[PDB]
Protein backbone atom coordinates (compact mmCIF):
# COMPACT_ATOMS: atom_id res chain seq x y z
CA UNK A 1 0.00 0.00 0.00
CA UNK A 2 0.92 3.71 0.09
CA UNK A 3 0.05 6.99 1.76
CA UNK A 4 -0.55 9.57 -1.01
CA UNK A 5 0.23 13.25 -0.63
CA UNK A 6 -2.71 14.76 -2.56
CA UNK A 7 -4.84 11.84 -3.90
CA UNK A 8 -6.68 11.06 -0.67
CA UNK A 9 -10.16 9.77 0.29
CA UNK A 10 -11.87 9.90 13.99
CA UNK A 11 -10.46 10.04 16.59
CA UNK A 12 -11.06 12.44 19.50
CA UNK A 13 -10.43 12.60 23.24
CA UNK A 14 -13.35 11.08 25.15
CA UNK A 15 -16.17 13.63 25.52
CA UNK A 16 -15.12 16.02 22.77
CA UNK A 17 -14.92 16.79 19.08
CA UNK A 18 -12.08 18.56 17.31
CA UNK A 19 -11.64 22.19 16.31
CA UNK A 20 -11.66 22.32 13.34
CA UNK A 21 -14.12 19.53 12.58
CA UNK A 22 -12.64 16.07 12.01
CA UNK A 23 -8.93 16.78 12.27
CA UNK A 24 -5.88 16.04 14.32
CA UNK A 25 -5.50 19.68 15.46
CA UNK A 26 -1.73 19.31 15.98
CA UNK A 27 -1.30 17.92 12.44
CA UNK A 28 -3.49 20.28 10.45
CA UNK A 29 -1.89 23.43 11.94
CA UNK A 30 1.54 22.66 10.45
CA UNK A 31 1.05 24.02 6.90
CA UNK A 32 -0.02 27.48 8.19
CA UNK A 33 2.69 27.49 10.86
CA UNK A 34 5.16 26.58 8.10
CA UNK A 35 4.09 29.89 6.50
CA UNK A 36 4.52 31.78 9.85
CA UNK A 37 0.89 32.03 11.00
CA UNK A 38 -0.41 31.60 14.53
CA UNK A 39 -3.32 29.15 14.38
CA UNK A 40 -5.67 28.19 17.21
CA UNK A 41 -7.34 24.79 17.47
CA UNK A 42 -8.41 22.28 20.07
CA UNK A 43 -11.48 20.33 21.19
CA UNK A 44 -15.13 20.93 22.12
CA UNK A 45 -17.28 19.48 24.88
CA UNK A 46 -20.43 18.22 23.18
CA UNK A 47 -22.30 17.88 26.50
CA UNK A 48 -22.24 19.47 29.99
CA UNK A 49 -21.30 16.49 32.15
CA UNK A 50 -18.29 16.24 29.82
CA UNK A 51 -14.91 16.14 31.64
CA UNK A 52 -12.26 18.24 29.82
CA UNK A 53 -9.24 16.62 31.48
CA UNK A 54 -8.75 14.31 28.50
CA UNK A 55 -8.64 17.10 25.91
CA UNK A 56 -6.75 19.44 28.24
CA UNK A 57 -3.93 16.91 28.54
CA UNK A 58 -3.73 16.68 24.74
CA UNK A 59 -3.66 20.48 24.65
CA UNK A 60 -0.84 20.66 27.21
CA UNK A 61 1.25 18.16 25.23
CA UNK A 62 0.66 19.89 21.85
CA UNK A 63 0.62 23.66 22.50
CA UNK A 64 3.45 25.76 21.09
CA UNK A 65 3.80 29.50 20.49
CA UNK A 66 2.29 29.35 16.97
CA UNK A 67 -0.33 26.73 17.93
CA UNK A 68 -2.40 27.94 20.91
CA UNK A 69 -4.97 25.44 22.18
CA UNK A 70 -8.54 25.95 23.38
CA UNK A 71 -11.23 23.91 25.06
CA UNK A 72 -14.81 24.95 24.17
CA UNK A 73 -17.82 23.91 26.26
CA UNK A 74 -21.05 22.70 24.66
CA UNK A 75 -22.55 26.22 24.31
CA UNK A 76 -19.46 27.22 22.30
CA UNK A 77 -18.28 29.56 25.06
CA UNK A 78 -14.57 29.54 25.88
CA UNK A 79 -13.67 27.01 28.58
CA UNK A 80 -9.87 27.24 28.69
CA UNK A 81 -7.02 28.66 26.62
CA UNK A 82 -3.50 27.19 26.70
CA UNK A 83 -0.45 29.06 25.31
CA UNK A 84 3.35 28.78 25.26
CA UNK A 85 5.59 31.82 25.24
CA UNK A 86 8.93 31.85 23.41
CA UNK A 87 11.08 32.58 26.45
CA UNK A 88 10.21 29.82 28.89
CA UNK A 89 8.46 27.62 26.28
CA UNK A 90 6.08 26.11 28.86
CA UNK A 91 2.37 25.32 28.49
CA UNK A 92 0.35 28.08 30.19
CA UNK A 93 -3.34 27.39 30.89
CA UNK A 94 -6.08 29.93 31.58
CA UNK A 95 -9.60 29.43 32.72
CA UNK A 96 -11.55 32.54 33.63
CA UNK A 97 -10.75 32.29 37.35
CA UNK A 98 -6.99 32.11 36.84
CA UNK A 99 -7.28 35.17 34.59
CA UNK A 100 -9.05 36.97 37.44
CA UNK A 101 -6.23 35.97 39.81
CA UNK A 102 -3.81 37.56 37.36
CA UNK A 103 -5.87 40.72 37.06
CA UNK A 104 -6.17 40.89 40.85
CA UNK A 105 -2.42 40.50 41.42
CA UNK A 106 -1.72 43.21 38.85
CA UNK A 107 -4.19 45.44 40.73
CA UNK A 108 -2.83 44.86 44.23
CA UNK A 109 0.63 45.30 42.72
CA UNK A 110 -0.34 48.84 41.72
CA UNK A 111 -1.98 49.93 45.00
CA UNK A 112 0.66 48.39 47.28
CA UNK A 113 3.28 50.22 45.22
CA UNK A 114 1.44 53.56 45.30
CA UNK A 115 1.27 53.11 49.08
CA UNK A 116 5.05 52.72 49.38
CA UNK A 117 5.55 55.69 47.02
CA UNK A 118 3.82 58.02 49.49
CA UNK A 119 5.39 56.35 52.55
CA UNK A 120 8.92 56.90 51.21
CA UNK A 121 8.20 60.26 49.53
CA UNK A 122 9.29 62.18 52.63
CA UNK A 123 12.61 60.46 53.25
CA UNK A 124 13.23 59.65 49.57
CA UNK A 125 13.36 63.28 48.44
CA UNK A 126 15.98 64.03 51.11
CA UNK A 127 18.33 61.95 48.90
CA UNK A 128 19.72 63.91 45.96
CA UNK A 129 21.83 61.37 44.07
CA UNK A 130 19.93 58.84 41.98
CA UNK A 131 22.41 56.14 43.03
CA UNK A 132 21.87 56.95 46.72
CA UNK A 133 18.11 56.75 46.19
CA UNK A 134 18.72 53.30 44.62
CA UNK A 135 20.89 51.95 47.43
CA UNK A 136 18.29 53.29 49.85
CA UNK A 137 15.18 51.97 48.13
CA UNK A 138 17.00 48.64 47.69
CA UNK A 139 17.58 48.48 51.47
CA UNK A 140 13.90 49.20 52.10
CA UNK A 141 12.83 46.52 49.63
CA UNK A 142 15.00 44.00 51.47
CA UNK A 143 13.53 45.15 54.82
CA UNK A 144 10.17 44.18 53.31
CA UNK A 145 7.88 46.48 55.29
CA UNK A 146 4.19 45.58 55.02
CA UNK A 147 5.28 42.56 52.95
CA UNK A 148 5.81 44.65 49.82
CA UNK A 149 7.81 41.76 48.32
CA UNK A 150 4.50 39.89 47.98
CA UNK A 151 3.34 42.43 45.39
CA UNK A 152 6.36 43.51 43.35
CA UNK A 153 9.89 42.60 42.31
CA UNK A 154 12.83 44.81 43.26
CA UNK A 155 13.01 46.07 39.67
CA UNK A 156 9.32 46.99 39.84
CA UNK A 157 9.85 48.72 43.21
CA UNK A 158 12.80 50.76 41.93
CA UNK A 159 11.11 51.67 38.66
CA UNK A 160 7.81 52.73 40.18
CA UNK A 161 9.69 55.19 42.41
CA UNK A 162 12.35 56.55 40.07
CA UNK A 163 10.74 56.18 36.62
CA UNK A 164 7.07 56.28 37.50
CA UNK A 165 5.84 57.24 33.97
CA UNK A 166 7.74 54.34 32.38
CA UNK A 167 6.54 51.99 35.12
CA UNK A 168 2.88 53.03 34.73
CA UNK A 169 2.97 52.38 30.97
CA UNK A 170 4.66 48.99 31.40
CA UNK A 171 2.05 48.12 34.02
CA UNK A 172 -0.87 49.23 31.84
CA UNK A 173 0.20 47.12 28.83
CA UNK A 174 0.05 43.99 30.99
CA UNK A 175 -3.28 44.81 32.63
CA UNK A 176 -4.99 45.78 29.36
CA UNK A 177 -3.90 42.48 27.80
CA UNK A 178 -5.39 40.39 30.61
CA UNK A 179 -8.54 42.48 30.72
CA UNK A 180 -8.80 41.66 27.01
CA UNK A 181 -8.34 37.97 27.73
CA UNK A 182 -11.14 37.96 30.32
CA UNK A 183 -13.58 39.17 27.64
CA UNK A 184 -12.91 36.08 25.50
CA UNK A 185 -14.59 33.90 28.15
CA UNK A 186 -18.02 35.56 27.74
CA UNK A 187 -20.23 34.71 24.80
CA UNK A 188 -19.15 32.53 21.89
CA UNK A 189 -15.50 31.65 21.39
CA UNK A 190 -13.98 34.02 18.80
CA UNK A 191 -11.15 32.14 17.05
CA UNK A 192 -9.36 34.82 15.04
CA UNK A 193 -9.42 37.17 18.03
CA UNK A 194 -7.95 34.58 20.40
CA UNK A 195 -5.12 34.23 17.86
CA UNK A 196 -4.10 37.88 17.52
CA UNK A 197 -4.07 38.23 21.33
CA UNK A 198 -2.04 35.03 21.88
CA UNK A 199 0.65 36.67 19.74
CA UNK A 200 0.53 39.56 22.23
CA UNK A 201 1.03 37.18 25.17
CA UNK A 202 3.64 34.72 23.82
CA UNK A 203 6.19 37.31 22.75
CA UNK A 204 5.72 36.72 19.02
CA UNK A 205 4.20 40.19 18.63
CA UNK A 206 4.74 41.46 22.18
CA UNK A 207 5.66 40.42 25.73
CA UNK A 208 4.26 42.58 28.55
CA UNK A 209 3.94 40.02 31.37
CA UNK A 210 6.54 37.45 32.41
CA UNK A 211 4.45 34.36 33.16
CA UNK A 212 7.46 32.57 34.63
CA UNK A 213 7.94 35.03 37.51
CA UNK A 214 4.43 36.59 37.24
CA UNK A 215 5.88 40.08 37.07
CA UNK A 216 6.61 42.93 34.67
CA UNK A 217 9.38 42.26 32.12
CA UNK A 218 12.51 44.38 32.17
CA UNK A 219 14.64 44.42 28.98
CA UNK A 220 18.37 44.64 29.70
CA UNK A 221 19.03 45.85 26.16
CA UNK A 222 16.13 48.14 25.24
CA UNK A 223 15.20 49.56 28.71
CA UNK A 224 18.20 51.80 28.37
CA UNK A 225 17.70 54.27 31.20
CA UNK A 226 16.69 51.49 33.58
CA UNK A 227 19.89 49.58 32.78
CA UNK A 228 21.87 51.31 35.53
CA UNK A 229 19.10 50.60 38.08
CA UNK A 230 18.60 46.89 37.28
CA UNK A 231 18.99 44.38 40.16
CA UNK A 232 22.25 42.84 38.97
CA UNK A 233 23.16 41.68 42.49
CA UNK A 234 19.96 39.71 43.00
CA UNK A 235 20.33 37.99 39.64
CA UNK A 236 23.97 37.24 40.45
CA UNK A 237 22.84 35.84 43.81
CA UNK A 238 20.21 33.53 42.35
CA UNK A 239 22.81 32.17 39.93
CA UNK A 240 25.10 31.42 42.88
CA UNK A 241 22.25 29.78 44.80
CA UNK A 242 21.45 27.70 41.71
CA UNK A 243 25.11 26.68 41.47
CA UNK A 244 24.93 25.54 45.10
CA UNK A 245 21.93 23.32 44.43
CA UNK A 246 23.74 21.89 41.41
CA UNK A 247 26.66 20.89 43.69
CA UNK A 248 24.39 19.05 46.12
CA UNK A 249 22.79 17.06 43.28
CA UNK A 250 26.16 16.30 41.68
CA UNK A 251 27.49 15.00 45.01
CA UNK A 252 24.42 12.79 45.31
CA UNK A 253 25.32 11.38 41.89
CA UNK A 254 28.84 10.66 43.16
CA UNK A 255 27.45 8.81 46.20
CA UNK A 256 25.24 6.72 43.91
CA UNK A 257 28.06 6.19 41.41
CA UNK A 258 30.24 4.97 44.30
CA UNK A 259 27.80 2.59 46.00
CA UNK A 260 26.39 1.28 42.66
CA UNK A 261 29.07 1.54 39.94
CA UNK A 262 27.05 -0.36 37.34
CA UNK A 263 23.79 1.54 37.86
CA UNK A 264 24.82 4.80 36.17
CA UNK A 265 25.53 2.77 33.06
CA UNK A 266 22.27 0.87 33.61
CA UNK A 267 20.15 3.93 34.36
CA UNK A 268 21.55 5.82 31.40
CA UNK A 269 20.93 2.98 28.93
CA UNK A 270 17.25 2.85 29.92
CA UNK A 271 15.08 4.42 27.20
CA UNK A 272 11.81 5.51 28.76
CA UNK A 273 11.52 8.08 31.52
CA UNK A 274 8.95 6.05 33.48
CA UNK A 275 11.38 3.10 33.54
CA UNK A 276 14.29 5.34 34.56
CA UNK A 277 12.22 6.52 37.53
CA UNK A 278 11.33 3.00 38.66
CA UNK A 279 15.03 2.15 38.76
CA UNK A 280 15.95 5.38 40.55
CA UNK A 281 13.49 4.48 43.29
CA UNK A 282 14.94 0.96 43.59
CA UNK A 283 18.45 2.36 44.07
CA UNK A 284 17.13 4.87 46.61
CA UNK A 285 15.39 2.24 48.72
CA UNK A 286 18.26 -0.23 48.51
CA UNK A 287 20.90 2.08 49.96
CA UNK A 288 19.90 5.71 50.45
CA UNK A 289 16.45 5.67 52.08
CA UNK A 290 17.78 7.03 55.38
CA UNK A 291 20.56 9.09 53.75
CA UNK A 292 18.90 11.59 51.40
CA UNK A 293 15.62 13.33 50.73
CA UNK A 294 13.83 11.19 48.19
CA UNK A 295 12.60 14.01 45.97
CA UNK A 296 16.07 15.56 45.92
CA UNK A 297 17.59 12.15 45.16
CA UNK A 298 15.29 11.76 42.16
CA UNK A 299 16.17 15.20 40.77
CA UNK A 300 19.86 14.32 40.98
CA UNK A 301 19.57 11.00 39.19
CA UNK A 302 17.21 12.43 36.55
CA UNK A 303 19.53 15.29 35.57
CA UNK A 304 21.37 15.16 32.26
CA UNK A 305 25.04 16.07 32.78
CA UNK A 306 25.05 18.36 35.81
CA UNK A 307 28.69 19.11 34.95
CA UNK A 308 27.57 20.88 31.76
CA UNK A 309 24.80 22.63 33.71
CA UNK A 310 27.12 23.84 36.48
CA UNK A 311 29.37 25.11 33.68
CA UNK A 312 26.71 27.08 31.79
CA UNK A 313 25.42 28.75 34.97
CA UNK A 314 28.95 29.54 36.16
CA UNK A 315 29.58 31.12 32.76
CA UNK A 316 26.80 33.64 33.39
CA UNK A 317 27.86 34.27 36.99
CA UNK A 318 31.33 35.11 35.67
CA UNK A 319 29.85 37.77 33.40
CA UNK A 320 28.36 39.19 36.62
CA UNK A 321 31.79 39.68 38.22
CA UNK A 322 31.76 43.18 36.68
CA UNK A 323 28.48 45.11 36.63
CA UNK A 324 29.85 48.09 34.70
CA UNK A 325 31.04 45.91 31.81
CA UNK A 326 27.45 44.72 31.31
CA UNK A 327 26.06 48.26 31.56
CA UNK A 328 28.71 49.17 28.98
CA UNK A 329 28.27 45.97 26.91
CA UNK A 330 32.05 45.51 27.06
CA UNK A 331 32.72 43.55 23.83
CA UNK A 332 29.41 41.72 23.84
CA UNK A 333 29.44 41.16 27.62
CA UNK A 334 25.74 42.03 27.67
CA UNK A 335 24.84 40.36 24.37
CA UNK A 336 26.43 37.17 25.70
CA UNK A 337 24.81 37.49 29.12
CA UNK A 338 21.37 37.85 27.54
CA UNK A 339 21.93 35.08 24.97
CA UNK A 340 23.13 32.56 27.57
CA UNK A 341 20.38 33.40 30.06
CA UNK A 342 17.73 32.98 27.36
CA UNK A 343 19.18 29.54 26.51
CA UNK A 344 19.06 28.50 30.17
CA UNK A 345 15.47 29.68 30.76
CA UNK A 346 14.37 27.77 27.63
CA UNK A 347 15.83 24.46 28.90
CA UNK A 348 12.89 22.51 30.35
CA UNK A 349 14.99 19.49 31.40
CA UNK A 350 16.27 19.13 34.93
CA UNK A 351 18.42 20.33 36.51
CA UNK A 352 17.64 23.50 34.53
CA UNK A 353 13.87 23.15 35.01
CA UNK A 354 14.03 23.28 38.80
CA UNK A 355 17.00 25.65 38.98
CA UNK A 356 15.22 28.25 36.87
CA UNK A 357 12.59 28.65 39.60
CA UNK A 358 15.10 31.04 41.17
CA UNK A 359 15.30 33.26 38.07
CA UNK A 360 13.03 35.61 36.21
CA UNK A 361 11.95 34.37 32.80
CA UNK A 362 12.73 37.36 30.60
CA UNK A 363 15.87 39.31 29.84
CA UNK A 364 15.48 40.78 26.35
CA UNK A 365 13.02 40.52 23.50
CA UNK A 366 13.74 38.33 20.51
CA UNK A 367 12.13 37.44 17.21
CA UNK A 368 10.83 33.91 16.77
CA UNK A 369 12.26 32.64 13.47
CA UNK A 370 10.09 30.69 11.05
CA UNK A 371 12.45 27.79 11.70
CA UNK A 372 12.02 27.78 15.49
CA UNK A 373 8.28 28.43 15.31
CA UNK A 374 7.93 25.53 12.91
CA UNK A 375 10.08 23.19 14.93
CA UNK A 376 8.16 23.86 18.16
CA UNK A 377 4.84 23.07 16.43
CA UNK A 378 6.42 20.05 14.74
CA UNK A 379 7.68 18.74 18.09
CA UNK A 380 4.21 19.28 19.55
CA UNK A 381 2.75 17.08 16.81
CA UNK A 382 5.38 14.41 17.56
CA UNK A 383 4.14 14.55 21.18
CA UNK A 384 0.45 14.35 20.29
CA UNK A 385 -1.14 11.70 22.55
CA UNK A 386 -3.87 10.80 20.05
CA UNK A 387 -1.44 10.24 17.17
CA UNK A 388 -0.90 6.60 18.31
CA UNK A 389 -4.57 5.70 17.85
CA UNK A 390 -4.55 7.24 14.37
CA UNK A 391 -1.57 5.13 13.32
CA UNK A 392 -3.19 2.04 14.87
CA UNK A 393 -6.32 2.44 12.72
CA UNK A 394 -4.19 2.52 9.56
CA UNK A 395 -2.27 -0.56 10.67
CA UNK A 396 -5.51 -2.42 11.41
CA UNK A 397 -6.88 -1.67 7.92
CA UNK A 398 -3.69 -3.24 6.58
CA UNK A 399 -3.80 -6.58 8.38
CA UNK A 400 -2.80 -9.29 7.66
CA UNK A 401 0.81 -8.07 7.47
CA UNK A 402 2.89 -10.52 5.48
CA UNK A 403 6.63 -10.54 6.09
CA UNK A 404 6.68 -8.39 2.94
CA UNK A 405 4.07 -5.75 3.54
CA UNK A 406 5.41 -2.45 2.23
CA UNK A 407 4.28 1.12 2.71
CA UNK A 408 5.13 3.93 0.29
CA UNK A 409 4.68 7.40 1.79
CA UNK A 410 4.78 10.42 -0.51
CA UNK A 411 6.38 13.54 0.94
CA UNK A 412 6.10 17.17 -0.25
CA UNK A 413 6.11 19.31 2.90
CA UNK A 414 4.04 21.02 4.10
CA UNK A 415 1.20 20.55 1.59
CA UNK A 416 0.22 16.87 1.93
CA UNK A 417 -3.04 15.58 3.37
CA UNK A 418 -1.43 13.71 6.27
CA UNK A 419 1.61 14.95 8.26
CA UNK A 420 3.98 12.00 8.86
CA UNK A 421 6.49 11.98 11.76
CA UNK A 422 9.43 9.68 12.55
CA UNK A 423 7.38 8.15 15.38
CA UNK A 424 4.71 7.29 12.78
CA UNK A 425 7.29 5.53 10.62
CA UNK A 426 8.70 3.65 13.61
CA UNK A 427 5.23 2.45 14.60
CA UNK A 428 4.74 0.98 11.13
CA UNK A 429 8.12 -0.68 11.34
CA UNK A 430 7.19 -2.16 14.74
CA UNK A 431 4.05 -3.60 13.12
CA UNK A 432 6.13 -5.55 10.59
CA UNK A 433 5.87 -2.95 7.81
CA UNK A 434 8.83 -1.65 5.80
CA UNK A 435 8.45 2.08 5.01
CA UNK A 436 9.71 3.80 1.85
CA UNK A 437 9.67 7.59 1.60
CA UNK A 438 9.08 9.04 -1.86
CA UNK A 439 10.41 12.61 -1.99
CA UNK A 440 8.59 14.99 -4.33
CA UNK A 441 10.59 18.12 -3.44
CA UNK A 442 13.77 18.87 -1.53
CA UNK A 443 15.96 21.48 -3.24
CA UNK A 444 12.89 23.69 -3.71
CA UNK A 445 12.70 24.18 0.08
CA UNK A 446 16.08 25.95 0.14
CA UNK A 447 14.29 29.13 1.35
CA UNK A 448 12.63 27.24 4.24
CA UNK A 449 15.30 24.78 5.29
CA UNK A 450 13.37 23.69 8.40
CA UNK A 451 11.25 21.70 5.94
CA UNK A 452 14.49 20.13 4.69
CA UNK A 453 15.40 19.16 8.28
CA UNK A 454 11.90 17.74 8.68
CA UNK A 455 12.52 15.71 5.51
CA UNK A 456 15.80 14.36 6.86
CA UNK A 457 13.95 13.31 10.01
CA UNK A 458 11.73 11.07 7.90
CA UNK A 459 14.43 9.86 5.54
CA UNK A 460 16.59 8.90 8.54
CA UNK A 461 13.85 6.83 10.19
CA UNK A 462 12.58 5.24 6.94
CA UNK A 463 13.66 1.88 5.54
CA UNK A 464 14.30 3.41 2.12
CA UNK A 465 14.01 6.67 0.19
CA UNK A 466 13.24 7.42 -3.46
CA UNK A 467 13.67 10.72 -5.31
CA UNK A 468 12.27 11.79 -8.67
CA UNK A 469 15.05 14.31 -9.27
CA UNK A 470 18.80 13.86 -9.11
CA UNK A 471 19.46 17.33 -7.76
CA UNK A 472 17.10 16.70 -4.84
CA UNK A 473 18.90 13.46 -4.08
CA UNK A 474 22.47 14.75 -4.29
CA UNK A 475 21.76 17.89 -2.21
CA UNK A 476 19.99 15.85 0.46
CA UNK A 477 22.88 13.38 0.42
CA UNK A 478 25.36 16.25 0.86
CA UNK A 479 23.36 17.67 3.78
CA UNK A 480 23.19 14.24 5.39
CA UNK A 481 26.97 13.92 4.94
CA UNK A 482 28.18 17.35 6.12
CA UNK A 483 25.54 17.85 8.84
CA UNK A 484 23.71 21.02 7.76
CA UNK A 485 21.06 21.82 5.13
CA UNK A 486 22.99 24.96 4.06
CA UNK A 487 26.34 24.17 2.44
CA UNK A 488 27.61 27.58 3.61
CA UNK A 489 27.54 26.14 7.15
CA UNK A 490 29.74 23.13 6.30
CA UNK A 491 33.40 22.24 5.84
CA UNK A 492 32.79 21.76 2.12
CA UNK A 493 35.14 24.16 0.24
CA UNK A 494 32.58 25.36 -2.31
CA UNK A 495 30.23 25.89 0.62
CA UNK A 496 32.77 28.03 2.49
CA UNK A 497 33.55 29.93 -0.71
CA UNK A 498 29.81 30.54 -1.17
CA UNK A 499 29.50 31.86 2.38
CA UNK A 500 32.48 34.20 1.89
CA UNK A 501 31.02 35.41 -1.41
CA UNK A 502 27.54 36.06 0.02
CA UNK A 503 27.85 37.09 3.69
CA UNK A 504 31.51 36.93 4.63
CA UNK A 505 33.45 34.13 6.29
CA UNK A 506 32.59 35.33 9.80
CA UNK A 507 28.88 36.17 9.43
CA UNK A 508 26.68 34.13 11.76
CA UNK A 509 24.29 32.34 9.40
CA UNK A 510 21.22 30.58 10.73
CA UNK A 511 22.04 26.91 11.31
CA UNK A 512 20.08 23.96 9.88
CA UNK A 513 21.83 21.03 11.56
CA UNK A 514 21.17 17.47 10.41
CA UNK A 515 22.40 14.50 12.40
CA UNK A 516 24.59 12.71 9.87
CA UNK A 517 23.37 9.45 8.35
CA UNK A 518 23.87 7.28 5.28
CA UNK A 519 21.23 8.73 2.97
CA UNK A 520 23.14 7.54 -0.12
CA UNK A 521 23.07 3.83 0.82
CA UNK A 522 19.31 3.76 1.39
CA UNK A 523 18.06 5.92 -1.51
CA UNK A 524 17.76 5.93 -5.29
CA UNK A 525 15.99 7.58 -8.18
CA UNK A 526 12.70 6.35 -9.51
CA UNK A 527 10.25 7.49 -12.19
CA UNK A 528 6.75 8.76 -11.53
CA UNK A 529 5.33 6.18 -13.96
CA UNK A 530 6.40 3.40 -11.57
CA UNK A 531 4.07 5.03 -8.99
CA UNK A 532 1.11 5.06 -11.43
CL1 LIG B 1 19.23 22.54 -1.09
From TrEMBL:
The keyword Coiled coil applies. The chain holds residues 37 to 573 of 942 of the full protein. Keywords: Coiled coil. Residues 103-130 form a coiled coil. This is Uncharacterized protein. GO terms for biological process: symbiont-mediated suppression of host translation elongation. The lineage of its organism: Bacteria, Pseudomonadati, Pseudomonadota, Gammaproteobacteria, Legionellales. It comes from Legionella pneumophila subsp. pneumophila (strain Philadelphia 1 / ATCC 33152 / DSM 7513). Disulfide bonds join 5-416.
